[PDB]
Each structure stands twice: as structure tokens, then as C-alpha cells.
Design a binder for this molecule. Sequence first.
Ligand SMILES: CCCCCCCCCCC(CCCCCCCCCC)(CO[C@H]1O[C@@H](CO)[C@H](O[C@@H]2O[C@@H](CO)[C@H](O)[C@@H](O)[C@@H]2O)[C@@H](O)[C@@H]1O)CO[C@H]1O[C@@H](CO)[C@H](O[C@@H]2O[C@@H](CO)[C@H](O)[C@@H](O)[C@@H]2O)[C@@H](O)[C@H]1O
Ligand SMILES: CCCCCCCCCCC(CCCCCCCCCC)(CO[C@H]1O[C@@H](CO)[C@H](O[C@@H]2O[C@@H](CO)[C@H](O)[C@@H](O)[C@@H]2O)[C@@H](O)[C@@H]1O)CO[C@H]1O[C@@H](CO)[C@H](O[C@@H]2O[C@@H](CO)[C@H](O)[C@@H](O)[C@@H]2O)[C@@H](O)[C@H]1O
Length: 404
Amino acid sequence: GYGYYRTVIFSAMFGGYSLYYFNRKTFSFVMPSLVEEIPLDKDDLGFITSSQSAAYAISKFVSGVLSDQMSARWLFSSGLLLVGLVNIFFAWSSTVPVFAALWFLNGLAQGLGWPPCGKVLRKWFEPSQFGTWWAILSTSMNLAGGLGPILATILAQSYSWRSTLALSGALCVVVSFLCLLLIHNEPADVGLRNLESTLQELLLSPYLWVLSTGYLVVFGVKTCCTDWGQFFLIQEKGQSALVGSSYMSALEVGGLVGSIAAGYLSDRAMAKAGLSNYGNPRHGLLLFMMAGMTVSMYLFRVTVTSDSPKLWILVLGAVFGFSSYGPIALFGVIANESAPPNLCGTSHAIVGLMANVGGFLAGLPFSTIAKHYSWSTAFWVAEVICAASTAAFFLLRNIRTKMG
Ligand SMILES: CCCCCCCCCCC(CCCCCCCCCC)(CO[C@H]1O[C@@H](CO)[C@H](O[C@@H]2O[C@@H](CO)[C@H](O)[C@@H](O)[C@@H]2O)[C@@H](O)[C@@H]1O)CO[C@H]1O[C@@H](CO)[C@H](O[C@@H]2O[C@@H](CO)[C@H](O)[C@@H](O)[C@@H]2O)[C@@H](O)[C@H]1O
Ligand SMILES: CCCCCCCCCCC(CCCCCCCCCC)(CO[C@H]1O[C@@H](CO)[C@H](O[C@@H]2O[C@@H](CO)[C@H](O)[C@@H](O)[C@@H]2O)[C@@H](O)[C@@H]1O)CO[C@H]1O[C@@H](CO)[C@H](O[C@@H]2O[C@@H](CO)[C@H](O)[C@@H](O)[C@@H]2O)[C@@H](O)[C@H]1O
């Protein structure tokens, strides 16, 4: 009788996470029609966004460490209420400091979304199907971000800005009780069945640092290419400004399909596996996609000129997105799967912590080296770094897998 329970649990988690991500960018969704009532500038916008980003960055790690002990049913609902209440309070106030102080709590509550879902997925679904549903659930954020602007446009036309956030908060509070009532933390509670590791042992496993370095390199390269690619294409390749938007759209469209396909293929690879404590069945795609990333970077840098047509650029962007948005999901799955059953949350939190520094590296230093020599001089550096990391991961493949 696993079918009904799995269906209802996944539906509840999908709706809950869609609402969590929708109630995170609602400020940006309603921003246009908010300056006429309260006169602001770009500095206030930066202040609020920075406060939210810092709060989210801290809360992700804190929640990831905490969720290993507290229930994964009383977090996924408490965070959603808090988000809804903060949204309502934002709706019923109009001044910069209350906005800045409320959005900090918004981010702090937003940080409590994923770890409970990951824990429930690990302790409910099969070990050979844990990557497909992970990838499918990850697309709720994409769906919310792609459909939200349209709903905001058709809603704020017939109402005001304070008339939208109140409804969003009411919806969040209403659905919080449903997600609390429907989610079962473990299959043993109902009456079904499913199938000694200190934290120091987790911190004393080389595989964790290998995964951390891989995630750092992949995320840094992706951030660099998705940030300064338009500037490279508009100031060195002599292309029209129109091709940048198409290039980014192709990159995102390819990335979504890449994530889903990587999840499904890695899950399929596990069925035909001679389970052991050495190696990893998901390592084939964790290397093939990185090689594809390097090849696509080389082709984008070398064989692109004003003579090149639009189709070539679109294909290159799609291939780069397909090869770039997959290894991130695979790193997440591997870090949340190769850990002791009572320490899944901590390992994922430590791996994800290694991404803020990657973003910082992909930020100002890249602009500095571009300012000193050129854009191509920095893209070549990124290329060689990625190639060296791919090689190093290639030789270091049979390292011990099970942490602890
Ligand atoms: C108890 C703390 C203990 C640590 C102290 C060391 C320093 C701590 C600060 C580091 C940290 C929290 C640390 C988390 C917990 C650490 C626990 C580790 C324990 C190890 C055992 C906050 O770091 C900064 O975040 C910046 C906000 O961005 C702010 O700088 C201001 O903004 C600057 C430009 O951003 C300007 O220069 C200027 O406007 C300010 O300067 C700062 O106020 C804040 O300090 C990490 O924040 C990072 O989150 C990521 C989110 O992805 C952010 O990436 C981006 O964010 C958005 C734009 O940023 C984008 O929209 C988003 O697309 C992109 O992803 C990063 O940018 C950064 O935000
Ligand atoms: C099993 C899946 C179930 C179905 C759900 C998932 C599939 C739906 C995907 C929807 C999708 C694909 C667009 C092509 C559609 C064909 C796709 C084929 C499948 C569908 C048949 C829409 O992507 C665009 O959709 C547009 C609206 O249509 C938005 O325009 C807006 O509207 C204007 C006025 O309305 C306004 O001026 C203005 O607000 C916008 O300009 C764009 O903002 C949005 O990027 C992807 O959305 C998702 O992609 C990711 C990429 O990482 C993006 O997240 C990013 O993360 C950071 C870095 O990772 C980025 O730095 C950050 O910027 C971004 O947060 C977002 O894009 C996210 O939302």
C-alpha cells in the first residue's frame, strides 16, 4: 500500500515547496508598482536583497545541521507559517527599516525548506529511485519562478500591492496545516517497514572534501559563464545584443532538461550495480558531463566570431547548460546518499557551504583579471581550472565511498 502514501507525501511536499519559493521573490514580483506609493531608490532594494541573502546563507547551514535531530514534519510547516506571517506583516507596513528587518526573518524562515524534504525522500523512496524524484521535486522552484510573474501581472492589475501579499500569506498559513497533517515522517509509523557514527568520522573522510572541491569548481565555472557570458559576447565577439538573451534562455532550458536527465540516468545506473564500499555507480555521469563542460567551453571560446550564425551560439549554450546543471544535482544526491542514515543533513549542509566561497571567487576576482588583461584571458583560466579538476576527479575515482 505504498502507492497512496508516496503519492500524497510527494504532492504535499511539491505544493509546499512551490509556495515556499513563490513567497521568496514576491517582493521582486510586485516591485514595479511599489515606488509610486513609497518613494525608494536602488540602494534600499540592494539593502533588502542583501539582508535576505545573508539570512538565507546562514539559515541554510544552521537548518541543515539542526534537521538531523528535530522532526522533519514540524520544520516544513513551521517555516511556511513563519514565511506567511512575515509576508502579511510586510503587506501591512510601509517604511524602509521595517522592510529590512522583516525580510531578514523571511530569509531565516526560508532556510528551513529543503532538509526535511531530503530526509523524507531518503527514508521513504527506494535507494534505486532516490535521484529521479529528487530531480523532479527540484523543478518546483523553476515552475514557481517561471509562472509567478504572469500571476503577479494579472493579479496586481485588478488590485493593489498590499492586496496581493496578504492573500499570499493567508494561502501559506492555510496550506501549512495541510502539509503538517498529510506528511508522515517515517513509513514505520503507519505500520509498514523500510530499511554508531559520530560526527568526527564524517569530518574525517576524504570523500567529503573531494565532493566539496568538485562542487566549488563546478559552481564557480557555472556562475562565471552565466554572469559574464553576455559581456564576453557583446564586447569581444561583436555579436548583436539580441543574441545574449537567447543564449541565456537556451542555457536555462538546456539546464532543466540536463538536471532531469542526469537524475533519471543516474538512478537507472544503480539497478545494474554490484553494491560494494568502493567506487560509485553515479560516477560515470559525474565525469562525462564535466568533460562536456570543458569541451563546450573550448568550442565557445575558440570557434566563435562575427561570421558564426545564431544557431551555433544557441546550440553551444544549450550544451553548456545541459552539462553544467547536472553535476550540481548529482553532487547533492551523492552527498545526501553516501552518508550515515542519522547524519544525512549535516553532510549536505557542509557540502553546500562550499558554494558561497565559489560564488565569491567567481565574482570580483574574475572582473579584476578581466580588467587587467581581457575577458578571454579569464575564460581561459576558468577552462584550464575546470579541465584540471575533471582530470583529478578522474584519477581519484576508486576512493572509499561510504563515509564513517
Ligand atoms: C555567524 C557568521 C560566521 C561566518 C563569518 C564570516 C563571513 C560571513 C558572511 C558570509 C555570508 C553568510 C555566511 C553563512 C554562514 C557561515 C558559517 C560558516 C562556519 C564555518 C565553520 C553573508 O556575506 C555577505 O553577503 C552580502 C550580501 O550579498 C553582504 O555584502 C553586501 O553585498 C555585496 C555583494 O553581495 C556587496 O559587496 C555589498 O552590497 C555588500 O558588501 C554582506 O552583508 C554579508 O556579510 C554569505 O553570503 C553570501 O550568500 C550568497 C547567496 O548565494 C550570495 O550570493 C549572491 O547573493 C545575491 C547578491 O549578493 C545574489 O542575488 C545571488 O544571486 C547570489 O547567489 C553572496 O553574495 C553572499 O550574500
Ligand atoms: C517537471 C517540470 C514541471 C514544469 C515546471 C518546470 C519547467 C518550466 C521552466 C520555466 C523557465 C523556462 C523558460 C522556457 C519555457 C520552456 C521550458 C520547457 C518546459 C515547459 C513547457 C522560465 O524561465 C523564465 O521564464 C520567464 C517567464 O516566462 C521569466 O521572465 C520574467 O517575466 C517577465 C514578465 O513576465 C519579467 O520582466 C521578469 O520577471 C522576467 O523577465 C524569466 O525570469 C524566467 O527566467 C525556467 O525558470 C527557472 O529557470 C531558472 C534557471 O536557473 C531560473 O532561476 C534562476 O536561478 C539563478 C541561476 O540559477 C538565476 O540567476 C536567476 O535569475 C533565476 O532565479 C528561473 O528562470 C527559474 O524561474
